[PDB]
Design a protein around this ligand. Structure first.
Ligand SMILES: C#CCN(Cc1ccc2[nH]c(N)nc(=O)c2c1)c1ccc(C(=O)N[C@@H](CCC(=O)O)C(=O)O)cc1
Ligand SMILES: C#CCN(Cc1ccc2[nH]c(N)nc(=O)c2c1)c1ccc(C(=O)N[C@@H](CCC(=O)O)C(=O)O)cc1
Ligand SMILES: *[C@H]1CC(=O)NC(=O)N1[C@H]1C[C@H](O)[C@@H](COP(=O)(O)O)O1
Ligand SMILES: *[C@H]1CC(=O)NC(=O)N1[C@H]1C[C@H](O)[C@@H](COP(=O)(O)O)O1
Lengths: 264, 264
């Protein structure tokens, strides 16, 4: 997509070389923002083939509050394998914080239900927020949250969302993150009888892994194709009741896939 | 400042009317980003005189972990009066979360100490973060955190910081928030033997209050002036040992102060 390729080129043009926790090395910038008007089309990268199946299942898994990879395996999704323990557990990562953030007094907060209720009853609230950044549980998580904090907004009958992504693997992770949040906006908008607005992506440490450079330049040589279109085929009774088969992506005509290794 | 006035004008031009929490009404946009290179000058708004006394004492108060306004009153700072209870308390707002975030099991994390130690021992970390958005304590706070989540970054010997501000009163609040975080970057950089980099400001619901419009038109009629220079006059033993007298803003030549009412 235009915005995505422009980000790649900005990292290449302006980034600094850094060492990192994995020992692989990155090229990084700090601070970026871009916007996807979801009425223009569904923002799934077209300059390489992306695996929408994994994106949808991962989101459904988050929304169930699950943090064990068994469900992903039942559906042949392997994107979290490298970080799970011997029992498949990731610790209290995204799904757990989204559905059951633990408080100091023994309560658990379902942030997804909270935001749906805010959108329905108080859409001009400036507090329609989900955070995965639970400081007190970071040490139990297999990986610290990358997509850390997000906020919803409503104007002119349209639902928007802004994500703060504190760490972004531009080549491998970002196409998944953008599509995931775009899907979530569509689902939330459906549940709240709203149209779709913008997905605003904001990055912190926004980087290209040193061993993704040939792949990145190959992708940059390609012209984006028209965005595909997302069709939802049912309105479930709640945001937690979607199924994989409720979604169809139409008109997705990507350039060939480009393989790259994930840094563990 | 150029970017600040551009944002003001953008809210006027593109903002939509909202009925908010208080019934006063705003013009609002969603999703914006600005960048201030701190080596270009200290980013204190020059198109009106800003009250540096309040900005500095508020930050020192946060760093003490204090959430009672008595310290502010001792120093003739009244910016938090409208939300404090009869004993001067605001609940577990910024200072408490910064210095003593409570874990579900009765422990605490001092996020500021953690950050200092990350900057000194692991400066390439992608996880140098402070969050005030303690979901499990929001209901105890007098006001939900506005400046909610911030991240540090080190490159080429320079310290940068990005703030996610979920709600932004462009006229009254934003000049304070920018100056506050800029000051914090200078203090942290001093304590860690770094130079200053960028302050990146990212906004969510970014608005002008309906009763700030005359003030906004006045300010937009003024041309910005060169930025002042921050001087720190002694280096304390730690980030927790600064005092008001340690700071001097040199070459601050603002247009006159502009008065406007705060929405409670
Ligand atoms: C974001 C996010 C979710 N996640 C979770 C996740 C966990 C740790 C990470 N670690 C690093 N260094 N980068 C990542 O982006 C990353 C992402 C993903 C993980 C891997 C792939 C990936 O390897 N994709 C390959 C192969 C996909 C497939 O299985 O067919 C690709 O070619 O796209 C995608 C998403
Ligand atoms: C951000 C922030 C901190 N805060 C905390 C704070 C708390 C609640 C708020 N509520 C609303 N609606 N807007 C604010 O920006 C706001 C800010 C501030 C609060 C008030 C002023 C203020 O009234 N400033 C006046 C007068 C300053 C003075 O006392 O001399 C000004 O002219 O600047 C500034 C900062
Ligand atoms: C993490 C998971 C995600 O959803 N998106 C990403 O892009 N993610 C990337 C970001 C980093 O490259 C890596 C995480 O490592 P750190 O915790 O930042 O050291 O995964
Ligand atoms: C809040 C405090 C701050 O530091 N900056 C701000 O700009 N703040 C403004 C934002 C809103 O105008 C108001 C808070 O009200 P909501 O919680 O957003 O309804 O204060």
């Amino acid at each position: 997509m235009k915005q995505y390729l422009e980000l790649m080129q900005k990292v290449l043009d302006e980034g600094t070389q850094k060492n990192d926790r994995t020992g692989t090395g990155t090229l990084s910038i700090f601070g970026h923002q871009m916007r996807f008007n979801l009425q223009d089309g569904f923002p799934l990268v077209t300059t390489k083939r992306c695996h929408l199946r994994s994106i949808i299942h991962e989101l459904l898994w988050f929304l169930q509050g699950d943090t064990n990879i068994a469900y992903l395996h039942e559906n042949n999704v392997t994107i979290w394998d490298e970080w799970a323990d011997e029992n498949g557990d990731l610790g209290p990562v995204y799904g757990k914080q989204w559905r059951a953030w633990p408080t100091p007094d023994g309560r658990h907060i379902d942030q997804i239900t909270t935001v749906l209720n805010q959108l329905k009853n108080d859409p001009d609230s400036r507090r329609i927020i989900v955070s995965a950044w639970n400081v007190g549980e970071l040490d139990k998580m297999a990986l610290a949250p990358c997509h850390a904090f997000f906020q919803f907004y409503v104007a002119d009958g349209k639902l928007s969302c802004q994500l703060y992504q504190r760490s972004c693997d531009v080549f491998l992770g970002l196409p998944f993150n953008i599509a995931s949040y775009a899907l979530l906006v569509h689902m939330m908008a459906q549940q709240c009888d709203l149209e779709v607005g913008d997905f605003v992506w904001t990055g912190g440490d926004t980087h290209l892994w040193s061993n993704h450079m040939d792949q990145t330049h190959l992708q940059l040589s390609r012209e984006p194709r028209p965005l595909p279109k997302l069709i939802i085929k049912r309105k479930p009774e709640s945001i937690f009741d979607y199924r994989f088969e409720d979604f169809e992506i139409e008109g997705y005509d990507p350039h060939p896939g480009i393989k790259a290794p994930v840094a563990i």
